[PDB]
Design a protein around this ligand. Sequence first.
Ligand SMILES: NC1=N[C@]23CC[C@H](NC(=O)c4cccc(Cl)c4)C[C@@H]2[C@@H](COC3)S1
Length: 389
Amino acid sequence: GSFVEMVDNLRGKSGQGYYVEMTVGSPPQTLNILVDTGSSNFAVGAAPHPFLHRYYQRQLSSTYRDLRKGVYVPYTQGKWEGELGTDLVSIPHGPNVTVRANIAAITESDKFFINGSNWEGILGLAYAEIARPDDSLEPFFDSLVKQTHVPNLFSLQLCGAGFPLNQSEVLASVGGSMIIGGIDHSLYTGSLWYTPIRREWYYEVIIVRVEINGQDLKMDCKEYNYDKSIVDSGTTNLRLPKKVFEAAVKSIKAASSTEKFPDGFWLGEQLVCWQAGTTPWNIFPVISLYLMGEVTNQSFRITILPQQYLRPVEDVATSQDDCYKFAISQSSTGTVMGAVIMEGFYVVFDRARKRIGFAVSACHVHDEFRTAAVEGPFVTLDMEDCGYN
Ligand SMILES: NC1=N[C@]23CC[C@H](NC(=O)c4cccc(Cl)c4)C[C@@H]2[C@@H](COC3)S1
């Protein structure tokens, strides 16, 4: 029904990530922690860094436990390195519980703590199979569910503002809700539709059809999920496999062709600005992603507006102009439905029943002519064929 104490517990924005307040150690040390469904490690800055206003101090925690194991976590656009341990951990605006949980204490990093992003750690909410160094390292949400009576389910309402937020504003604004252990009915409208989690590693789903303004992209559906499709709040953009990305950009280009933009716009590098309030939303197409249903030969679709895929940024100069970057980009690791897609929907991570549910978000950005949508059913065949092996 309602989990009031948890509503409004998030802050941030798609460009810097959305975070939750957590406490670690005895006495409690307060940190802001990235909410990240595309990884499985609870990891927190543990030594001074130019971009950390605070950090985990283990010697000040009487409940700290040293696991005496190192962990090294490199990805393409950055990396972190640190020391494993356990401690006591709470979420002040979450359920009224304290659990013992694995903490990776981060001792060295690169391009990980971004300047004035406001978070000091990351909460990987995906399954043990992609935890580092191996799956024996129990992810925070598993610890929580084993140690308390909190149901095996969480739900995310990420709220994009629709315009830029300065650092004072980003700190003062409510950025959404993470409901731990439940579904809050005031965070969405219309029905929740559910798609099966294909495999408990990332939050993996299957896309069976893509449309731009109703026009079927008409690729073999295996391309849409090559080599996987995941829901991932720790990534900004909607990321698409090279072949899908090329065909989608061609289609979006065609549909918006009454204005032409620099190639740097479509590559997500440079911004485009219009005079205050004149953004031509209507020239940009909607994007529908059809997902596999729970019922045999039944799918459903989530529909997003350019208000989701054009990400609001502050102008290079100083103007009153409304400026945006193109928040769809190329991926070599399969489809990634990031913050900008998730901002359109209430997303229910139903671990217990091995499914993800989507509903129109009560805080999604729209205009008077269109809104985001979650609709079904559609009769679709050979949907298993869309998955990659
Ligand atoms: N899901 C993933 N998590 C990882 C840690 C978090 C990283 N994101 C950010 O710092 C970030 C920055 C700005 C906006 C947003 Cl939304 C996120 C991305 C990493 C990639 C490799 O795995 C680890 S993908």
